[PDB]
Structure formats: C-alpha cells, structure tokens
Amino acid sequence: NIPLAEEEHNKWHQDAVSLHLEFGIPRTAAEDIVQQCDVCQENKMIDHWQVDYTHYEDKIILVWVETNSGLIYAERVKGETGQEFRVQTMKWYAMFAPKSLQSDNGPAFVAESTQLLMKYLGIEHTTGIPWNPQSQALVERTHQTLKNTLEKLIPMFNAFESALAGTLITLNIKRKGGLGTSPMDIFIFNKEQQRIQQQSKSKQE
Amino acid sequence: NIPLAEEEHNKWHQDAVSLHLEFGIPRTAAEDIVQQCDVCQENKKRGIDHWQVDYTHYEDKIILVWVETNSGLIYAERVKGETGQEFRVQTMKWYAMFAPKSLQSDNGPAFVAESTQLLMKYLGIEHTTGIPWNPQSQALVERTHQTLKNTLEKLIPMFNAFESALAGTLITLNIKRKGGLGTSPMDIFIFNKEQQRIQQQSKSKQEKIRFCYYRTRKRGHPGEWQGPTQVLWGGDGAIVVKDRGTDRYLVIANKDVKFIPPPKEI
Amino acid sequence: WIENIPLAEEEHNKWHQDAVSLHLEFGIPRTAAEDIVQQCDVCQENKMPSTLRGSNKRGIDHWQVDYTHYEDKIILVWVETNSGLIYAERVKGETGQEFRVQTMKWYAMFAPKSLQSDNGPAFVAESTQLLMKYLGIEHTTGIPWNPQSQALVERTHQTLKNTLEKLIPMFNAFESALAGTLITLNIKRKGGLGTSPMDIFIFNKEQQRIQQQSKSKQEKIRFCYYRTRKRGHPGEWQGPTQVLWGGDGAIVVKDRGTDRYLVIANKDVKFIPPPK
Amino acid sequence: WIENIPLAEEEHNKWHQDAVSLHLEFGIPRTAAEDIVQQCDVCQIDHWQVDYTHYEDKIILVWVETNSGLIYAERVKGETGQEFRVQTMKWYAMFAPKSLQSDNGPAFVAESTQLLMKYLGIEHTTGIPWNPQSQALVERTHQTLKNTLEKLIPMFNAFESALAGTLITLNIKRKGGLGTSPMDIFIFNKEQQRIQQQSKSKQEKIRFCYYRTRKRGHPGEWQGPTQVLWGGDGAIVVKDRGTDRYLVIANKDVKFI
Amino acid sequence: IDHWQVDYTHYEDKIILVWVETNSGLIYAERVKGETGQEFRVQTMKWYAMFAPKSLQSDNGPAFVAESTQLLMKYLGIEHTTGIPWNPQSQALVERTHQTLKNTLEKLIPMFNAFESALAGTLITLNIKRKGGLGTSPMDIFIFNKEQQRIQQQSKSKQEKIRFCYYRTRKRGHPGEWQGPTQVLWGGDGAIVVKDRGTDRYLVIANKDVKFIPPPK
DNA sequence: CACCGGAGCGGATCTCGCAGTCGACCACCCTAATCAAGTTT
DNA sequence: AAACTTGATTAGGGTG
C-alpha cells in the first residue's frame, strides 16, 4: 500500500498523515514518502509538545500543549524554578510518552540538568524564541481559554488543583471537534496506531 | 437530555459541539445552552457554515477563494477581475455548489458592491464585511492561502489547464488531505451538514408541542391567565406544566388551561 | 383569494372574527383561516378551553372520598372508583387524626388498594400520607378546584342526601338512617342485571384472587413478530414478543417502544413455532 | 405560517420549486402552496450520468446523480474532449465519484478522457444508455431543466448565475420524499460510505486476551491467550480451548493484549 | 477497563495514593500529604483529568467512603464501590502492584533528587518501559483498550441482523427444558451467546441445545 | 390498472357561561412571626 | 451579660 501511496503522492502530493490515514501504512513510512518527494521538499509553507509557564491569579501553572492533537496538561506550580520543572517533566514524562519539545529560553528549561534530563529521558529539547504560527496560535489560545475555563470552574471547586483539573477535563476530554474528536481522541488513536507498527519497528530500527 | 446536557454544561462549560455530540440533543440546543449560559458568553460567534473570502493573485491569475471557517473546507476558482458582477456570477455558482449559512470578508469592492450585498439578501446569506479580526479566522485563512500557493506551485506543471490544476489543489486539500482519524475538510463538512439537516428533521418530525395560559384557584377563585408557557406532559383534561415564578411543575385543570399553538410570536 | 388573505388578515386584526365568516367572505381555504387566530394574539387570548376531561374507573379497591356537612353534620364518605360500592360515616371533626382513625376502620373492612382524595388537610396530613405508605397504599390527590376528580363522592352526596331526607324520620338515629342509606345504595340499589355494587366488589374480590392468576402461568406462551406497512409494504417483524393472548383475527401484544399493550391483526402476525 | 406563507409566495416566484418543497420548507399549508404553483404561471452511490444538451445555443454539461437525483451542470463552450476534461476535473474536484454512465460521444469515448478516469480511478462506462430507470430521470431532467431556465434566466443578467439558480432549485430548494432534496439524499449517502469503511476498520482487529477463573472465589492462574470473540458489559466471550466451550469472563478477570 | 482500585500506601513516610486498573494493570501514583478525604477529592479531580474512569474500587477507608467524596464520584459520573477488599482476582494485582511499586521506588529514589521525580520514575518503568507478550506496555494495553472502546464500533453492531433462538441447559447431561426465545447475543462456532432472563447472566448454549428461529418471511 | 396515502370540509360530539356587585363565617391541615425558657464561651 | 437553640400559641395559605 506504501507503493500506491507514493504513486498517489507523486501524483497528488498529500501529507504523510493523509497517506498514513488513507492507506493505513505506518506514519513513518508515509513520512518517508513525503520527505523523499522533491515536489514536497521543494514546496513547504508526533508526541511533540510545547511549554510555557503562566500565572493565573497569582498561581503559576506549568502548561504542556501537544502541538498536533491540541491535547493539554497542567498542574499548579509553586515557582518557575528549574528543579520544580525537572520534577514536573519526570511526572509528565510518566503521564505521557513525549518524543520532542519546544519552549522559550526561560530559566527552568535552558537549565543544565534540565537539558540533561531531556537527554537522560532522551526527549529532543529545542530552546529558543518560538517562531512558529503553527504552535503559537494554538498555545496562545490555549492560555486564553484555559484561563477562561479556570475563571468558569474555580468558583465551583474547593481546591484550585481540582478546578485546574476541571479545565484539563473539559479541554482534553469533554471538548470535541471534527467528528467529535477531543484532543485525547487524536492522541490515543495515534499511539494505538503506533503500537502495531511498533511491533514491526523493532525489526525496522 | 437537553436539561441534563445543560447540567453538564453549567458544571463543565463545554463547546456547543461537544455537548451536542456528547448527549446527541440537537446542536442548536447545545448552542442555546452555551448562549443561555452566562459563563461562556461572559468569556470567549459562528455556526457550522460560515465562510470567508479573499481574492488571491497567483501568477497574475485572480482567484476567488472561499474558506469555511469551522471545517476548514475551501473552494477557489480563477477569476478575470475582482469586480462586483463577475464575483456575483461566481458566488451564484458557488451557492449552487454550497449551502453557506453566513459569510465574512473584508471591505473589498465586490463584497461592498451594492447589488452583491443585495444578492446576499436575495440569497439570504449573512454577509459581514469589515477588517477581519479573528485569530481563529485569520490564521486559518492565511495558512490556507499560503498552502494554496504552495500546492498550486506543486501541481500546475503537471497539468495543461491551470484551472484543472486548481481543481487539483482543491482535490488534494478538501478530499485527499486528512487529519486526526482521516478527516478531510470535505468529510467534516458533509458530516456537519448531515447532522444539521438531521437536527431539522429531528425537531420538525418529533415534537408537536402545545403551549397555554393558565390560572389557579384561591378559595376556588380562579387566577388570571398567566405565563403562557409550555405543555410538558399531556394528559386528557390536564397536563404537566412548569410554574415560571416558582420554577416548579404543576398540574392544571383544562378548564383553567387556555391552549396556545407552540410557536407563539416566533 | 390567496392574496386577498393579507387584507382579510387585516380584517381580523381590525375586526377579529371567526375563521369561517372570514373564510367565506374572503372566499379562501378555511384552514389557514383558522391559523389566523392560531396566530392572532387577540382572538387567541380570550377563547375558552373546550375540554371534556375524564374520571377514573381505575382500580379494583381503588377509592375516592370527601367529607360531608349534611345539616351541619360532618360525614366522611368512602366511595369506590371502579365499581363504586361505597361506605360513609358521620364524624365530629374532619381532622387528620380523626380521619386517620376512620380510614383505619374502613380500610380494615376491605383491602382497598389506592385512593383519590382532595386537598383537605386531613387527607393531606403528614402521618396520613405516611399511613397510606405504612400500609402500602396509593393516595392520589384530588387537585385544586376540581371536585370533578372527586366526582363520585360529590355525586353520591347528592344521592345520599335525597335518601336521608326519606329515611331519617323513620329512626331514632340519624346515623342508623345513615346506615339505612348505606345499606340501600350499597345493596338495595340494583340495576342493569339487577345487581348492587356490593355484588360487583365482592365478586371481583373473588375475580382478583392471586392464586388463580399465578396458576395460569402453566399455559403456553408463543411469541410473535408484528410489522408495519409503509406504502403497502410491511416492516420487519418488530421485533418478536409473546402473544400475550390471542383473539380471533387478532391478539394481545405490547410494544416495548411504548411499553403498552396492543393489537395485531393475525395477518400481520408471525406465529413463532414451539421449542421441541 | 401566515408570516411564512407570504414570504414563500414571494420566494417561489424567484425559485419556482414544488408546492411540496415549500410546504416542507416553510411549514405552510401544502394546498395553499399548490395554489401558488397553479397561480404561479411560471411552473404552469456516487454513480452518475452525463449528457450534453443545448439551451439557446449554449452547450451545457449535465451531471446527474443516479440515486439521489442530484445534479451538477455548467455552461459549456464546446463538446470537445479537452474542455470536458477540465470540466470533469473540476467536477471530480467538487464531487467524489465512484462511477459514471454516459453515451458513446467523442469527448467521453476520447482516450485521454478515459485515461483521466483511470488517473482519477473512476470507472468510465460508455454505450447506448439503455435504462428506463436512468433515462427517464435523464429525460425529466432535461425537460424540467429547460423549463426551469426558461423560468429563471430573464431574472438574471448573467446566464451562469441563472443556471446556478436552476441547480439550486433542483439540488437545494426542491425537496422530495420527507422534505429531502437531492443534495440531502446525496450527502447522507456520502457520510454513510465512510462510516461503512470505519466500521470495517474496527472489524479488522480480532483481539486476544488472557483470563482466569474462580474456585470458591479463589483465583485461577492466567489462561490463554485466546481471541476476544464478543465483548459484553463487564465481561467478554472467549473459547476455552481446554473444553472447546465458550466462556463468559469478567473484564477484571481479563488481560487484553 | 477503567475499573480502578485505590489503596493508600506509605513508602518511607510518604503517603502514596496508588491507582490500579483491574484489567490492563495500568496505575497512577502520586505522593500525598494525607489520607484526608479533601486531598483525595483533589487527587481524583486531577486523576479524572489524567484518565476517564468509569468505575472504582477501594477499601472502606475514610477519604473514600466520605460523603462529599461519594458526591464527587457522582458529580464526575464514576461508580464508586467501597468494601472489605475481598477479591484475589483484583487483590493479587493490587498486592503485587504495591510490592513491585515499593521495590522500584527503592531502586529509583537514589537516582533522582526528588521523590516525586523518582515515584514518577517508577510509574515510567511500570506503565511505559515494562512490556509483555509481544512487547506491549501496560500503558499500551490501556491505550489499546480505550481505543477499541469507540462508539463507531457500536454503529456497525447496530447495522447487523440479530437472530433469535430457544435454548436449554444440561444437568448431568440431561437436557433442561428449552428457554427463551432470546437474542442470539453473539454467533459462535458450535454455540452462541444468550443471557438468562432469569438470572440476568450471559451464557453460552451449544447449537444442539439451541434452536435458531427463522426470520419473518 | 388496483391499492394505499396526504390534504380537505361537512357533519358529529363534548363542555360551559349568560343569569348585578359577590363574599361572610366554618372546619381541617400546613406553615410561620413572636414570646418564654435553658445553657455557653 | 451577648448569643444560640427549642417549645408554646395564635395569624396567614390550600381543601371540603
């Protein structure tokens, strides 16, 4: 099916997501179709994330945002210090399977043993001024409607971590788009599709 | 489910889409929940079919792009000139190709041309001209035209007709291109139209409501005719209704039930 | 006339008339001419609610009551719904406690299974309600400004007071005369086939015997598909469920869709063969 | 009603649908709608068919949906192969065809047409179109079409506008069945295809799992793997291979694999 | 699936609220300040963000059986089951879960500054890195499970025919009386699935102890 | 061409108010403002 | 010596 997907790609030049999803080929193979197509590498406009700290009513919130699914995570934060962030990306590298990261150059992320925790855990960490309209619209609006839905939910709840969890529930889980796709729908699909190729990928590596 | 979906909303405060799809009530009911919920209306309007246009020049070829805002489904067609009338012809064709609930655009001439807005009125479409301000919109529209010129530049060598190449890009993006579970904008769109239509079918076919005025007896002495409000549960000779004042259900003697057709002034 | 209509409409908006005279004089179809006053405010407002209503035959041992003030005598009256055999007794006060005792008496006379009764406080009283509950009985509420749900007891207040006016001189006691009326209409009134209510209550107590109902379980069940014809063309068998009872040319069945008993003519039945 | 009813009387003079369609649009009385159509002098899956036809020396390409009855069409300069090639490139852009009917005309039976049906993967069928089921729909489509242009076109400066209007009358505004226009039936079929496909995709997996059983409540050790035959609520089905007898197994007593 | 069990556990005077999924074996754990109901309400709000629990087990402990905890489980639409923990099916899993949990904590806590980092480490080893069978992780088994819990699966099952049948059951081989007619709940090979309407329980009946019922014809 | 269905209107069925302004004083059940009787930090 | 809860005896709302 990968063959007919590259014939179809040289013809119509789809995304690797679209050839993956069209032909059921592993997404790695579809990426190899596109990235080898010179039409697509001449013409250019998973588990990949961004972080920025944010304060919501004198409460720092470490805000993880997955660049593809739009799927978010958060936890209340005592300080923007690096060691706390190392603990948060240990916990968070537990709660997810991150491939790669973007972020600003802020102190926690650029910090040496934080970077060495990205190498230890093995995540690709790109530190720099985020330049991309792709991420920054989504992350900006994420802080917008996050601080919104916090402002909606926090009166209801005793704890602030309870209401914070509330927002994460609404956006990760209750919220949907497309055909009734929450972000978590997108992610669980992408991982469970990663499993079956993943049983092949140990042979492909 | 509509009261329960609303209960889920005032708790959680979801999208209209999410409450709708979750509880399967009609989506305008979910919209109305969000809209009758002060919490979401305090902090933030587009239905499903909402389009935005921008003319786009590529290779000295004027192209009249349409961009649906929600699905991200798009149309475009090459153009001779940006005029009112040619644009009127294009959008007539388009509205044969499209059922669009509302439009946005900027203040460009054909948009702001008089008979074009009159033609939005002939066609009854909500037209909004003005500086398009929405980060939801402008990122989508901008990336849409960038990706448009991108894929034009890919495909036009492969085709005799630049028009069939443009059709090519619409195929790639609206059909072939996918996201999430395999969703192209076309399939998202067709789905949304489908469930929306079916919202009409649901609402029309099922419920024959009735409404009434009502009154009550004090030492037997009947009340004035009141509300009026809605038949909740019908029974022969008496019913269930809500007291708006007490927010409370009540059983009223038909004699004291002044019947009304449902739609009221609406 | 199709375009006479907005003027005729105006003439309702002006002169506010029936769908008919408007229909005819403007010479239109009448039905939207009714949709006028459907859509009128004015004429929509002040019309009356033509509504027939209904009373409940309801249940064996299902009951209905109201107290009486006959010649300044509180008389609380115990009156069946279905076959409408009755009882009553003179009372000194209407009160919930007193009432509760009265119903203990009368309840003990029978196995009365349920009730309709009005908003009178003694009917309504907390421990009264708890007493119905205590005994596993259904009170139901006669509602504001409907004696008519309380129909039969008021009816019988008529009948009775006529009979009182006969009998009471014949007795030492008003309440022996009360016994006399009670006697008569629960018995001596006999009609149709020349039967009292007492006949019918008691008969039906024999009729309502649980052991017989339990026993008929041994009789066979079959299920059956019913189905429905749209432009002549019958649906799938909808579903398949037991032939609750068969008649000649049709049966007893339930739609789970309505959860309600139903008929199917035996042509639109599938008979479903036995296990074997 | 009586606010809708005039407005539909206004709109039929524009759009000239069935009385049915307006009854089913606006929720008016049908018989009044019928009174308009009489009193309106003017009226007084993914399997398709193409025909050309001429309306006032304007060649037109006519697509017709063999099931929903939906139509695409556009004004045409000529019956050439190449023009129609770009037409149906655009049509395949706006539509997602499986299949097609047509006659043996040159632009169809022209090769690069058919090669482009292969490049696009449509199964092109030319031949003497034989079918009353099709050709009656074809027939009424043409007669009622040019009827309908002849209604609308004087309202319109540009003819492409009016033609688009005819398409709108038929596709969009006109209804059939329960109030179902052609586009209604059409879009329904479209969305039904994909969910057929998704359903098959979920039918593909056939998962297996470990399981165990209780003795006086005390557990058995894990057993299997064995296929997940049918899921229930709180439990599944599995074939016991030991007894060759299927087992209802609590989900908590399972490890899905 | 999404049937979870809790036991608070103390590791080195650190209360650890240990979620254990009864089926995948997936877990969550976090260091906890106290066994308080309120803190537990916060933790289960957080964790109901991190997962989509349908249902719950736990012991009868104070936080769990707490009133507004119960109202919270209702508020979130989770079924909370409180009990003397009496099952070896789930309690074998929970027992070994806590044992291996403290084991891996003792492995990882030297390797990390924070105990939340190291406890996170244990969840990584056990949910992610730990693998079984063909090499799927318990987290993969959870993802897997959740992924096939889709409603578009339900649509196709609605599209199918069901056929109905009588059924009987054997005692010492002696065939019982026929029963139903009922749903063929699933067609098998040599048998099918049926619920007993009497005991409200799914059951299998060999096709000889079945009589399938023909369609409306 | 026969059979079933949506829309239409004449006829048939059921409930009720016009009787001047309506309350005045009972009896029962349920709810509530106000006063009197204790402690407790 | 302020406040805090509960029992007792007449004034209003739904029903004969």
UniProtKB/Swiss-Prot annotation, chain B:
Coiled coil: none annotated. Residues 210-262 bind DNA. This is Integrase. Zn(2+) binds at H9, H13, C37, C40. The chain holds residues 1229 to 1503 of 1506 of the full protein. Mg(2+) 3 binds at D54, D106, E142. It comes from Maedi visna virus (strain KV1772). Homotetramer; further associates as a homohexadecamer. A zinc finger (Integrase-type) spans 1-41. Catalyzes viral DNA integration into the host chromosome, by performing a series of DNA cutting and joining reactions. Residues 42-193 form the Integrase catalytic domain.
